[PDB]
Design a protein around this ligand. Structure first.
Ligand SMILES: */C=C(/F)C(=O)Nc1cccc(C)c1Nc1ncc(OCc2c(Cl)c(OC)cc(OC)c2Cl)cn1
Length: 299
């Protein structure tokens, strides 16, 4: 019953569905092979991610997916976001086809690449050199800021910006994920813990958590938390603090400590991002420039 949009429509028979990547309120995601995503090379294979509805989805579920699809159409393409590739709306189930990042999300990317602990026996000339270096960590932060700046310019507020919502390509390019999700901000279970132990309330700006107010400056707060995640190499924010305690600590103006092996320049940016007044936090344009200066000084 959905209208045809020839600009984005992709023949569903050119998809070969593969391994499920995840399922939830937002639909289910399946890895797939696509043939001829580039119309110039009709028989060329590529690996993509496909969002679709679940089993006994309701009419609301379909509306939510159609909405996310249209939002992704509207926002357009950028290097540092997960981009819309095509859609399947005709003669069959609704598919939304997007880019698939090979290396997973940034949190797991970092946690899997923490430096060798002294418990490992030295072997060869690089025994203490881990996969992650400071300039690459800074580059990760810079790329996310660039993506958010783009999303900002298209009037998009993410509302959950976190390392888990940043994906990493085969070339270590950062791509912001799920930026067009309806997130039900008027019915958030602040005590909710995910299957992997995440407490999403720990990324919310105070004005969002306490006043249900979101601006781009709310995302800047979240970016500050994400900065902290990066330079703890995928650590969980507010260590050992449960949600009830988080509430009172935030009301008292509590902020996270400077992490180990983190230069003052970057903790400085974190603390700026967590300034109480939204207007006293940097803009994403300012964050891009600030991080670019560090990047150029160390590259
Ligand atoms: C396809 C390979 F790269 C792959 O299997 N990648 C992979 C493997 C494990 C874990 C992750 C996170 C992962 N990457 C990955 N990349 C993209 C992706 O797409 C999800 C998705 C969808 Cl379906 C939509 O549809 C609207 C929007 C969106 O955003 C925007 C994202 Cl991120 C899932 N996983």
């Amino acid at each position: 019953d959905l209208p045809l949009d020839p600009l984005w429509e992709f023949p569903r028979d050119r998809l070969v569905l593969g391994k499920p990547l995840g399922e939830g309120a937002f639909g289910q995601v399946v890895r797939a092979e696509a043939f001829g995503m580039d119309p110039a090379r009709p028989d060329q294979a590529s690996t993509v991610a496909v969002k679709m509805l679940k089993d006994n989805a309701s009419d609301k579920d379909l509306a939510d997916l159609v909405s996310e699809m249209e939002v992704m159409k509207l926002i357009g393409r950028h290097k540092n976001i997960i981009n819309l590739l095509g859609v399947c709306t005709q003669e069959g189930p609704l598919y939304v086809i997007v880019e698939c990042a090979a290396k997973g999300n940034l949190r797991e990317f970092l946690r899997a690449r923490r430096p060798p602990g002294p418990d490992l026996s030295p072997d060869g000339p690089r025994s203490s050199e881990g996969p992650l270096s400071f300039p690459v960590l800074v580059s990760c932060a810079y790329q996310v800021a660039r993506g958010m700046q783009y999303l900002e310019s298209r009037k998009c507020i993410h509302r959950d910006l976190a390392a888990r919502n940043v994906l990493v390509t085969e070339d270590n390019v950062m791509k912001i994920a799920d930026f067009g999700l309806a997130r039900g901000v008027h019915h958030i279970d602040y005590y909710k813990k995910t299957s992997n132990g995440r407490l999403p309330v720990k990324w919310m700006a105070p004005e969002a958590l306490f006043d249900e107010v979101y601006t781009h400056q709310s995302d800047v707060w979240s970016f500050g938390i994400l900065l902290w995640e990066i330079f703890t190499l995928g650590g969980s924010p507010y260590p050992g603090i449960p949600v009830e305690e988080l509430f009172s600590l935030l009301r008292e103006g509590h902020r996270m400590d400077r992490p180990p092996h983190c230069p003052p320049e970057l903790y400085g940016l974190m603390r700026e991002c967590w300034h109480a007044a939204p207007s006293q936090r940097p803009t994403f344009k300012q964050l891009v420039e600030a991080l670019d200066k560090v990047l150029l000084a160390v590259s």
